[PDB]
């Protein structure tokens, strides 16, 4: 049968790819960074405790100015915090209270949110009248929205639970490009610093690197063993890290096209919800289901510290653009800032 | 001097935002959100339609907001998603109750309903949420039992030795076979709830009273009991 021949060809191609990757791995990251001195005991403290949310916080996103941030809760609100003064700038009620994601535009002009309504709503913050109102209702996804990131004021990449990603032209409200190839619900999405590429981790234990312009999957990484919930690009853009239900963080390299290091501990058995690198990429903060966020040595895989204090499951994580602080939101409707 | 004015404006805006937030919380904490789950043939649509017709109210969610005895309610059915639910089911980890609907007259797909109930009950996040079990389509179950063409023991070998429980209500004009089948299905669903509940959450089975308002009353009573038990547990008295 033709299906058997196609499956055999796919297996042969996978074997060839694995053989090439094995031949390409002449050493390991641990075997090379063994001579560098470890980071000292990392101790962050809760500088601010942003409170005012009703239900569990599901996502957050820092601003480019590294002062304002936006968070989305499951009670149907979008609160924009002035992190320096703990004040609230905006509180946008949402048509659907089931919201899984939120984003901050690089210019700070708009915000985006989405969820079980399968719609990416975009709200204009700095309008003429000063009242935040929905500007575009991006529809076309047949699954829940899980992540959204602004390319610029007129473009946004959204990942959905219909196993497809998309690039939206906000002005026309239409899908410029569709990224298909995932066999499971896409859960995370991370833009490269150059914005020309992005990665997405789905519930099929695979992360695919996509091309924004051409709309094709350049590379696929299959080092995990469970659904991938988080993904974050390295500051260099040549690597990224992933979190998964199998209680492991894994660093993949784009040029080597294979996994470089794993960050797991015997006593850690809960899933990972959010990951984010430091400004220099030396630290890898990762939220967990055990209400704790662990700081990992991105070069030596030593757990440098722990950010304890959240009463419920940590769900979102984010490091400012200048690396000044890291903000963690969890399911007890509380946001915290650490440095 | 600009900084002082900017900070004063920020504080005033934050005060307005917090006032609106507390006004919204006063309503959010007084509203009960119920998540409707089931199968294609379970019959959630008729329940939603009856509850909307009895009390006037109300894409990817079949939202419905109504008011029953000056108590706010919110019934939503998650349609339009894919068959995989292990990720979006985590949103409803703070709902008041889960209204699980079963087709009692469909023996072929009864094990699928049992497996779905087991998965919902044993979920890590859905482990503190009580389930209101709705055993729909009782007239069809009675017709199937009385016909005799299809036997429960064909799909469930444990029905041969099953006996009607002592605490069974003898509805007027009820054949012993019909009530035996009803209570066998109810006990099959209750074993999963009692096997791992450990008092964190409860199950409230209810054979549908044909097409009557009694189902809405049962939902209201179950929600009231859940709220009472939640208050007792928060006070440390249960």
């Amino acid at each position, epitope marked *: 049968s033709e299906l058997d021949q196609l499956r055999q060809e796919a297996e042969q191609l996978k074997n060839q790819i694995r053989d090439a990757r094995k031949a390409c791995a002449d050493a390991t990251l641990s075997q090379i960074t063994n001579n560098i001195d470890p980071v000292g005991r990392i101790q962050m403290r809760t500088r601010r405790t942003l409170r005012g949310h009703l239900a569990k916080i599901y996502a957050m996103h820092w601003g480019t100015d590294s002062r304002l941030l936006v968070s989305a809760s499951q009670d149907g609100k979008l609160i924009i915090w002035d992190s320096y003064t703990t004040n609230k700038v905006h509180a946008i009620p949402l048509r659907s209270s089931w919201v899984m994601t939120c984003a901050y535009a690089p210019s700070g002009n708009y915000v985006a949110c989405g969820g079980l309504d399968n719609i990416c709503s975009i709200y204009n913050l700095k309008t003429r009248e000063g009242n935040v109102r929905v500007s575009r209702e991006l529809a076309g996804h047949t699954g829940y929205l899980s992540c959204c990131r602004f390319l610029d004021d007129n473009q946004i990449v959204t990942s959905s639970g219909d196993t497809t990603c998309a690039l939206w032209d906000i002005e026309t409200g239409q899908q410029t490009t569709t990224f298909t190839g995932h066999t499971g619900d896409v859960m995370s999405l991370s833009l490269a610093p150059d914005t020309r590429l992005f990665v997405s981790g789905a519930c099929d234990a695979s992360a695919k690197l996509w091309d924004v312009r051409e709309g094709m999957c350049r590379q696929t990484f299959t080092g995990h063993e469970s659904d991938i919930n988080a993904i974050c690009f390295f500051p260099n853009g040549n690597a990224f890290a992933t979190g998964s239900d199998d209680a492991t963080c894994r660093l993949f390299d784009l040029r080597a096209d294979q996994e470089l290091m794993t960050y797991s501990h015997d006593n850690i058995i809960c899933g990972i919800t959010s990951v984010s690198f430091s400004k220099s990429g030396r630290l890898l903060l990762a939220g967990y289901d055990d209400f704790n966020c662990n700081v990992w040595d991105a070069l030596k895989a030593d757990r440098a510290g722990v950010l304890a204090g959240h009463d419920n499951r940590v769900s979102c994580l984010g490091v400012t653009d200048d690396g000044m602080a890291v903000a963690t939101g969890s399911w007890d409707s509380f946001l915290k800032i650490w440095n | 001097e600009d900084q002082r004015n900017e900070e004063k404006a920020q504080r005033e805006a934050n005060k307005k935002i917090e006032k609106q937030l507390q006004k919204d919380k006063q309503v959010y904490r007084a509203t009960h959100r119920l998540l409707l789950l089931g199968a294609d043939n379970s019959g959630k649509s008729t329940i939603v339609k009856q509850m909307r017709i009895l009390h006037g109210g109300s894409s990817g969610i079949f939202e419905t907001k109504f008011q029953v005895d000056k108590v706010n309610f919110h019934m939503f059915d998650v349609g339009g998603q894919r068959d995989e639910r292990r990720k979006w089911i985590q949103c409803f980890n703070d709902v008041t109750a889960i209204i699980f609907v079963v087709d009692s007259s469909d023996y072929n797909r009864l094990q699928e309903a049992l*497996n779905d109930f087991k998965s919902i009950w*044993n979920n890590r996040w859905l482990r503190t949420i009580s389930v209101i079990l709705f055993l729909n389509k009782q007239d069809l179950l009675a017709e199937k039992v009385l016909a005799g063409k299809s036997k429960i023991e064909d799909y469930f*070998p444990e029905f041969a030795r099953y006996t009607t429980p002592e605490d069974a209500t003898p509805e007027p004009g009820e054949d012993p076979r019909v009530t035996r089948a009803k209570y066998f299905i109810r006990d099959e669903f209750l074993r999963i709830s009692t096997a*791992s509940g450990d008092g964190r959450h409860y199950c409230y089975p209810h054979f549908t009273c044909a097409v009557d308002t009694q189902n809405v009353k049962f939902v209201f009573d179950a929600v009231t009991d859940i709220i009472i038990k939640e208050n007792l547990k928060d006070c440390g008295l249960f």
Partner: nanobody, 128 residues
């Protein structure tokens, strides 16, 4: 990558016997609860059996209880399903499934039309 390969299916006369295997690779076997699923022609995917990580907890469907036996061996990373007293309606494609997350009692989306942690399946046919 997570990969499950099944074997053992084939022609079996009614009242015969069979044994299925599931060579699991790409993940630690002793951390996940395993499953067996089948798909009869013209019918949807139907759960058959499951087994705990250590093999202590085992459950089947009503139509296969007393005929099918599920077992696992964490040393060889394989899952077995011995099938006895086969009947013609058992003709189906049998898939070896895995729970999505480790250390988890409940199992979600095992019988979905698409599921990443599922094998290609082996056709089992029963006819005299």
């Amino acid at each position: 990558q997570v990969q499950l390969q099944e074997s053992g299916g084939g022609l079996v006369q009614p009242g015969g016997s069979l044994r299925l295997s599931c060579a699991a690779s790409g993940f630690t076997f002793s951390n996940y609860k395993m499953n067996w699923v089948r798909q009869a022609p013209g019918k949807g995917l139907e759960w058959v059996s499951d087994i705990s990580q250590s093999g202590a907890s085992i459950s089947y469907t009503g139509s296969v209880k007393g005929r099918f036996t599920i077992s696992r061996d964490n040393a060889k990373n394989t899952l077995y399903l011995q099938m006895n007293s086969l009947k013609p309606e058992d003709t189906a494609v049998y898939y070896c499934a895995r729970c999505p997350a480790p250390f988890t009692r409940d199992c979600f989306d095992v019988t979905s039309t698409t599921y990443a942690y599922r094998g290609q399946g082996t056709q089992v046919t029963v006819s005299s």
